[PDB]
Design a binder for this molecule. Sequence first.
Ligand code: HEM
Ligand SMILES: O=C(O)Cc1ccccc1Nc1c(Cl)cccc1Cl
Length: 408
Amino acid sequence: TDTATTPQTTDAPAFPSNRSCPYQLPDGYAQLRDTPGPLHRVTLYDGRQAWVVTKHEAARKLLGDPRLSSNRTDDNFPATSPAFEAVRESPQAFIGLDPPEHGTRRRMTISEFTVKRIKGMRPEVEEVVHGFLDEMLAAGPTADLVSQFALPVPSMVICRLLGVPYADHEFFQDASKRLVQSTDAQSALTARNDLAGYLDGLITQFQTEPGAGLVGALVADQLANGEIDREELISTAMLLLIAGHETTASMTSLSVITLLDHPEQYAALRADRSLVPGAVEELLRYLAIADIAGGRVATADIEVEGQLIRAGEGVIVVNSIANRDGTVYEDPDALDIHRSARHHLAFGFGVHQCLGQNLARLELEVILNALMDRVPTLRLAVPVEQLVLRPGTTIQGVNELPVTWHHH
Ligand code: HEM
Ligand SMILES: O=C(O)Cc1ccccc1Nc1c(Cl)cccc1Cl
């Protein structure tokens, strides 16, 4: 059988790409960033072509365009790995809904994420952060920052918000990781079913004995009024549980790696804590850990600066690339905790903009202040070159981060 004997250059490169450095664009993404025009063709894992959005203002425009639907069950939604077919087959939380249905479900959860509520959560967050730090610092001279700090902290916080008992954390933390990091459909489906069966039992328990937290409130109110389906409640709680776990944990580990590679800026941050909120925004822009959250499908033709998105085409708004748009962020590939990182897209834009964004901002501020206060000598226990980054088909991050510090 004959083989390929011609040049292999394509104008639709394979997407997504994997990071080789935790805080820099994959080489292929830098190329997309540099090509003029808002859109570029890519080839997804199964050979199907899709569009990516690579510029900041076009990304805002298209995330705001109701002709780009968030319906993951659509046959033309841009799947980036075989594991996505698990979500195409499963019931949908409001992240997969379009207006008006999106708003009726999202509004059932917003009361837990208001600015006033986030402010009232600071003592619990600080207590949780410092508690896990107490344990880690006492347990040995080295640690895995991920399993001992980065993951348990947001896990405990989101479980309190939801009413999910932390006694079961080994089970649902493992199931959350399996679902988010699954590479095939069968392991994704099993992880989803594991969480679904758990949450289903929690719902019945709350119907017997009304419970705390957001799940308790949805059971007692919207579910008892038929305003949400039981299966929808499960999907909604599952989305909040997984996002509340995995996103902040990834930001924590990648922020530590990044700050230790920029010691001048880390030292400036320690000397002036009023810089921490701005540094968190810059880290969000720079690390942009959730490109997998940009998929859309066109329900009508859309004209974009001379290019045409046709009805039925998949579109991925790649916020990591849009966040490196030099017409918005001067010298976009430089970390600068003093820059204005305003208007970044790490949380999206428009009706689906991250519900948890200010909880995440609170958590990362408390976490960075606590690391600088309690472990100012924190350092990586292995070279950055020995770390293993997750692939571009999931939330960016590291699954293990060996660290050490000065003893007690
Ligand atoms: C820590 C950093 C985080 C990042 C970078 C991030 C990123 C994102 C992005 C980019 C979207 C837009 C998805 C889209 O347009 O389809 C989104 C939506 C969402 N995020 Fe976050 N997220 C973070 C933390 C959290 C946390 C802590 C929660 C807590 C529950 C959360 C819950 C949600 C929900 C429910 C949505 C769907 C909003 C909607 O569809 O209306 N996220 N997130
Ligand atoms: O988005 C979903 O429906 C669930 C899901 C599963 C695996 C990986 C990511 C996600 N969602 C997701 C998104 Cl789209 C953005 C931020 C955080 C999370 Cl957990």
